[PDB]
Structures are given as C-alpha cells and as structure tokens.
C-alpha cells in the first residue's frame, strides 16, 4: 500500500551517494501519509522542491531535520509523532544545524541566506513520547513561542526541551490573529491551536474550553467531536474509523466453547491500525500482531499462496543461521574470516550480510585475516536473506556476484541505513550475476560508483519490487552505451532482453527452452541424445527405461509408466530394467517373484513356500 512508507535510520550520517539522496526521499515519501519509523530530512540543498512531503500525517518514530540549507520544509499536515524510536534516544523532534554560517560563499549581497526559517507545523498537536531538541539554526523563528507542554502527551516521560534561540535574524511578531502569542510562523494560519492545557477537568485532550468539548479517551491529537470516530489521531489503534485500545482478538468466546476468530471482525495489529490480513512482507503471529521478526520459541513457516506466519516449536526450535544484526552477530557489522564459516550450508539467513573493505583487507589488531575469495562460496546454497545485502568491497578477481547465484529473495525487513535492501558501491565488478534473484521484499536498491559494472539496465528491476516506494537508484556505474559498444548485451535467447549478465545461463526468462540453467533452442523431444519432455518451458529428462523413438515423440512424463515404449521388461506400475525377484515390498509382506516373457512382460510364476522360480532358479 501507498500511504504507508518505511522509516529511515541514517541519523546525521552523510548520504551514501548524494547525487541520488533527494531521489530516495521522493520515492520513499511521495504518496506517504504514515511513516512507520523515523522521518529524517538531512543534507537538503537550498533550491529543493520538497513538495512530496505534503501528505505526511503520522510519524511512528522521531522527526529529524538536520544539516539542510533549504528555507522551508512543508510538513504542515503532520499531526502526531508517536516517538516509538527516539533521536539520541531522548527526542521525538530534533532540528539541528540547518543554516550554515556560510562564509560569504554567496556574493556579499546574497539574494537571500540559507537555513530553515519557521517550523510550520500547523497540525502537530501530539508527541506521545520524547522531548524536543533544537540547536544551531540561525535563520529559525518561533521555536520558543510554542507551548510544547501542550503538544507532549499527558503520559509523556522524556518531555524535555533544549531549544537554542541564537538567531542572525530578528523575528517579526506572531500574526495579530494569534491571541496568546504562540505560532509556528508569521502567517495567520500558523497559530498554535491548543488541545490539552486549555481543557476541562479530568480529561486528556479536548476541542475547546468546556466538558462538551472533551475528546474521547481513545483520541490523541484532538477531535472534531466527542465520540470515538471523531478523533484526529488515535492513541493506539484505528479499527476502521473507530479508535480502540486493542484490535479485536482472534479467539472469541462463543457462549458454548472457545470458538475461532471473530475474523469477519477479528484483526491484526499493524502499526497503529487494525487490519484483516497482514500486508506483504510481514509475518502473522497468533497473538494478533503483524511483525518483522517472530516471537521467541517460534518458527517462520510459509504457505502455498505466499503468506508467512509464526507458530510454536512444539519440538525443540530447530537451530538457524543468523546474519549480522541478530543474536551473536548483533553488532559485528561485517562478514569476516572470524565468522564466514558460520554461513556454510545455509538455505536462508535470518539477518543481513555486508561486505566492507575490512572483510577483504587485514584488520590485524583484530587478528582476523583477510577473507579469501575462495571462502565466499560458502554462500552457494543460500536462497533467502531476511535482512539486507550490502557490498562496499569485492575481490577484483571476481567478475560478478555469482557466489550469490542462488539467492532468490532479499526480504528487506531490516534495511541498511533504514532505506536500502540491496546496496552495491565501489566494486568494479562487470555484471551482477544474480540469476535466481526474483524479489526484493522491502526497500530500495542502491547501485553506484561501480566503474566497470555493466548489465544494470538489462535487469527488470520493476518485477523484483513489491511495495511502492521501491526503486533502483543508480549513478556513476559504467555508461550504458560504453557496454553494448564492447559486446556486452543480453544473450539472444533472453526473453525481452532481460539478463543478469553475458550468456544463456543469465536470462530471466529464456525465450524458448531451458535445460538446467541454460537457454537452448530445442528440447530433445524428437532428435535427442537423451530423450526429454517439456513441462512449463523446461527440458526434463525421460526415464532411462523409455526407449528412444527415432522420428517420433518418446515420452509424456518423467516417470517410467509415462513412457511410450520400454527398452527392456515391463511391470504394469512402470518401465523396468529387471523383473522383480523377491524384493521387500514392505517391512512385513510377501516377496514378489516374477520372470520375463518373450513378450517383455514380467509374469508371476507358480510356487509353494520354500523353493521358488527365478527364470529356472530356486
């Protein structure tokens, strides 16, 4: 769904590639109404349309606005900031280092100076958790006029305020329409509307001075009237219009026994809303939650349709491969020689993999030797990464990422910098080579500064992406046409021109037929060394007991019964090489003793008990 977007989690760290940093933000927020993490707006230039932020109404985590030369940041409609994650772990709103003292970089008579001017938060009437940090904005006005105690929730511990008010600019008074002299800006529309301190007795939020005006106990930012259904924002969960404290549980008590879900009504907690099914990429627990990691003593299982859930390990919980950012690798940050052997023979990684210079270079104080390129083939068996994949560094003796040629999915439930499920920078590989990769579950893809990397536009990126607000961000790789110039283009057999690299082992869909992992013109349905059939565009072998049919088709399935015409002796179940003599059919069953005919048929033969017939043999 659009209207939900992921957080971000980069704090003050500089954009990985600045040339595409504004792009990531626009994709990531263009249609968004609820951020489900941190809204972080850092390093934005002076002339920078931020028109895409206009629809943001809730922020689940914190709001950071830091190191930007832009004058205004249009978050007018933003109403609540729940502060589930905090910046510096003690601030829901943090506003830092926006105007640059600038050093007369511009002419002495600059058209105007840079730096945020007013906060313009006409609708922020709720901060459920966390304080306010405001430092070193020289053009900033009105930060100190606001009454922040009104915004902080009744129950907001951490309601601290450190607000520098050093300004290079004198602030014109609040518009005269703002009796009280509290406002977010010069405009008459910027007056701080009050909803907590101006309340009648024993309430929490209110529309006005009296007890008629008091908001329902499940409201959070105010209300247009008294009922639940009348809130602006819900303290907990928006159950399709009504604000409630819990989502309806999924085990009702029918009057006669503990029956199953009121699920025509029972719902899953997903953020601050009740939903019927968890959205894509999230797991369902049995406790009515939508999650990104399962509960303890639990296992991720799947379903034929696609849905993933959590259920109890009724056995001992079978042991798993953790990636970085999980358990014993919770804070380690690189795949190195000290831990490479832990991923040996893993189909699926719970967590992430990052490869930094320190992986392949020494780091001798650690005493961890450099990672050998031979060691990377630990990952041949790997089909699924639940976290992200990040590669700052890669052996130059390797052309591609074939080591990960059986990677099918990257879930992106954990995201690098909070934003990216697949990042690749500074590598000088020549093509990607992830022939199996079929979906990036969450997040964007960032592929930049790979001098020799071709085979980027050849990838059908749009069919890896699931949720909107996913994109490929790319710059500073090798020029597309400098690639086809040198003879790097998809194999002619690659359907629609999509490949991960040179040759017929790298197509996305073969145009014609696929034998194994290579595209081919013809299966061996007629003229064939080994005879084979077709099945959903594949060449799969016939049974070794089907007989080659010179000119005509040789089989219709992989089994021996499926065969056209057997090459030796037949037993009705299927084509066989040797008629059975006294094999164990079951642990406690009679032995089947048969013999050939001249007709090739295995017929049973007459016996008593102790001596039998095996073509004249006891």
């Amino acid at each position, epitope marked *: 769904s659009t209207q939900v977007c992921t957080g971000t989690d980069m704090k003050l760290r500089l954009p990985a590639s600045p040339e595409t940093h504004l792009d990531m933000l626009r994709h990531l927020y263009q249609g968004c109404q609820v951020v489900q993490g941190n809204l972080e707006l850092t390093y934005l230039p002076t002339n920078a349309s931020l028109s895409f932020l206009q629809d943001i109404q809730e922020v689940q985590g914190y709001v950071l606005i830091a190191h930007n030369q832009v004058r205004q940041v249009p978050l007018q409609r933003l109403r609540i900031v729940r502060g589930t994650q905090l910046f510096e772990d003690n601030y829901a709103l943090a506003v830092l280092d926006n105007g640059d*003292p600038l050093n007369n970089t511009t002419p002495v008579t600059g058209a105007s100076p840079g730096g945020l001017r007013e906060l313009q938060l006409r609708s922020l009437t709720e901060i459920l958790k966390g304080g306010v940090l405001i430092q070193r904005n*020289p053009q900033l*006005c009105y930060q100190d*006029t606001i009454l922040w105690k009104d915004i902080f929730h009744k129950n907001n511990q951490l309601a601290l305020t450190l607000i520098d*008010t*050093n*300004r*290079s*600019r*004198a*602030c*014109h*008074p*609040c*518009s*005269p329409m703002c009796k009280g*002299s509290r406002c977010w800006g*010069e*405009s*008459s529309e910027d007056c701080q509307s009050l909803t907590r301190t101006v309340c009648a007795g024993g309430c929490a939020r209110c529309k006005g001075p009296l007890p008629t005006d008091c908001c329902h106990e499940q409201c959070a930012a105010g209300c247009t009237g008294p009922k639940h259904s009348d809130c602006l924002a819900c303290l907990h969960f928006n159950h399709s219009g009504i604000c409630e404290l819990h989502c309806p549980a999924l085990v009702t008590y029918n009057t006669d026994t503990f029956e199953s879900m009121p699920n025509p009504e029972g719902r899953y907690t997903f953020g601050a809303s009740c939903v019927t099914a968890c959205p894509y990429n999230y797991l369902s627990t049995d406790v009515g939650s939508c999650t990104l990691v399962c509960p303890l003593h639990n296992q991720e299982v799947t379903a034929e349709d696609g849905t993933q859930r959590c259920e109890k390990c009724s056995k001992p919980c079978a042991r798993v491969c953790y990636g970085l950012g999980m358990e014993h690798l919770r804070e380690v940050r690189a795949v190195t020689s000290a831990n490479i052997q832990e991923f040996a023979g893993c189909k699926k990684i719970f967590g992430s993999l990052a490869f930094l210079p320190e992986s392949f270079d020494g780091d001798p104080a650690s005493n961890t030797a450099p990672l050998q390129p031979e060691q990377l083939q630990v990952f041949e068996t790997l089909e699924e990464i639940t976290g992200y994949l990040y590669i700052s560094a890669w052996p130059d003796s390797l052309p591609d990422l074939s080591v990960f040629q059986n990677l099918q999915v990257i879930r992106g439930r954990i995201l690098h910098n909070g934003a990216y499920s697949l990042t690749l920078q500074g590598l000088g590989i020549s093509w990607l080579g992830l022939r199996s990769l079929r979906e990036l579950g969450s997040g964007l893809a960032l592929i930049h500064h790979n001098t020799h990397l071709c085979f980027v536009h050849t990838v059908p990126w749009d069919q890896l992406f699931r949720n909107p607000h996913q994109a490929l961000l790319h710059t500073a790789n090798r020029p597309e046409d400098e690639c086809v110039g040198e003879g790097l283009a998809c194999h002619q057999l690659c359907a629609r021109g999509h490949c991960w690299g040179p040759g017929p082992t790298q197509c996305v869909n073969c145009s014609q037929f696929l034998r194994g992992q290579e595209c081919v013109e013809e299966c061996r349905v007629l003229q064939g060394l080994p005879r084979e059939y077709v099945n959903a565009r594949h060449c799969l072998p016939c049974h070794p007991e089907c007989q080659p049919q010179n000119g005509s088709v040789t089989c219709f399935g992989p089994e021996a019964d499926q065969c056209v015409a057997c090459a030796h002796y037949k037993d009705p179940p299927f084509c066989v090489a040797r008629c059975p003599s006294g094999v164990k059919p079951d642990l406690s069953y009679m032995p089947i003793w048969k013999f050939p005919d001249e007709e090739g048929a295995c017929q049973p033969c007459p016996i008593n008990c102790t001596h039998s017939c095996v073509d004249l043999d006891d």
Partner: single-chain antibody, 233 residues
C-alpha cells in the same frame, strides 16, 4: 527608496494640563504583509539624556509609561497624544519606524511649557582622517537573545540609523549611507558591542547611541545607552 518620516509640529509651547498631539507621516505604509502590526515607535528625549521608548506598534504602550501618553494611527499617518502635559513631560519626542531597512527617524518635536543597562565608553576627540572604536557594555539581560544597533544623533539633533549586529552570530546589516564609515563588531563572551568609525571627517561630529532590540513584540529598539560624543578636531 528610503522611508521618510515627517513630523508636523516642529515645536509646541503650551500650558500645564493642556492636551497636545504630535503627528507623523511616512512616505510608505509602516506595516508588513503577513501582519496588521504597524512598525512605528515613539521615543522621549528629555534634555541631558538618552532617548527612551514610550509606544511601539503605534497602538501599544511600553510598560511603566503613564496613561496620558497614547498611540494612535495605522497605515501611513500616526499621532501621539498627551491628555494633559505635565512638568515631567517637557522633552523632544521622536517618531521612529522599523518596518523597512534602513530604520529611519523623524525630525523631532520639542514641547515646552508656557534591569537593562547599556554602558557606553567615554567621550572622544579625534583628528579628522583617523579612526576611533567606541564600545558598549550590556548588562541585566541575556546578551545573546538580543540585537544591538548604533544610532547617530548629529549637532542639529536628528537621528540616523547606522546598523544592527546579531549578538550571537555577529552578522551585521548596514545602512548604505554608513558602509565605508562604520563597522560593527561584538565580543559576545564579554557582553560588549563595538563600532569603529574610520576616516573621520567633520560631519562625523555627533553623539553615537547604542540601542538594544529583541524579538517578536520586542522587535522595536527599546533601550539606549548614555551616548558617546565623538568630536573631530
């Protein structure tokens, strides 16, 4: 174009208890787009001493100044009125706008019958063609939360705005008339503002006032220092 403020009565001689008006017209309207505020203050200079603010925002009266003094007007004409002039009220009263840079003042009007502290440096005698650096030490208020201006008052006693320095970032706006002439500085660590008059000539003979200013309702310049006379040989 610079905003010209022209006051109507050059001087009024008058009986105790009588009612007076003093009028001020400006060449453009002293308002800002976003607000209905009118960016005009009235100041009182009783001889011997520094000007003091009575009424900012035209309508609004500074706290402490008696009820006889009242501000009237909006748009382009403003009038001060004293219900009954007392013996304490013999002074020169200066019109003063702060809507557009440069800040301008009015000619003055002398009426006749019938805690913040900015401590300026001592007086100065200066050879024409040399330079001098006058100081100003602030006290009784959070220094970095306010601005500091410089205003010249010349022999004939009219007022010219020199400039403004932020007392935290040290950024300065100048009047173009004083670009070569004055340079504002601030040692924020000591609560001193400075000004440096350079290449002094005869027309720089004047008294140089240091004037505080703040934010929002306290936008207008409120507190003046005692003055430094700089006379050139």
């Amino acid at each position: 174009a610079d905003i010209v403020l022209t006051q109507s009565p050059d001087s009024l001689a008058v009986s105790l208890g009588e009612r007076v008006t003093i009028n001020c017209k400006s060449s453009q309207p002293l308002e800002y787009s976003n607000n209905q505020w009118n960016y005009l203050a009235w100041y009182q200079q009783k001889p011997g001493q520094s000007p003091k603010l009575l009424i900012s925002w035209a309508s609004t009266r500074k706290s402490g100044v008696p009820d006889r003094f009242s501000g009237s007007g909006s748009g382009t004409d403003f009038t001060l009125t004293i219900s009954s002039v007392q013996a304490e009220d013999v002074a020169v009263y200066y019109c003063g706008q702060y809507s557009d840079y440069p800040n301008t003042f009015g000619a003055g009007t002398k009426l006749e019958i019938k805690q913040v502290q900015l401590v300026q440096s001592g007086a100065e005698v200066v050879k024409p063609g040399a330079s001098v650096k006058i100081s100003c030490k602030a006290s009784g208020y959070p220094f970095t939360q306010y601005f500091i201006h410089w205003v010249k008052q010349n022999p004939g006693q009219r007022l010219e705005w020199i400039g403004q320095i932020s007392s935290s970032y040290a950024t300065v706006d100048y009047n173009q008339k004083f670009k070569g002439k004055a340079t504002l500085t601030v040692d924020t660590s000591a609560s001193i503002a400075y000004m440096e008059l350079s290449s002094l000539r005869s027309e720089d003979t004047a008294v140089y006032y240091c004037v505080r200013s703040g934010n929002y309702e306290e936008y207008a310049m409120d507190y003046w220092g005692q003055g430094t006379l700089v006379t050139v040989s």
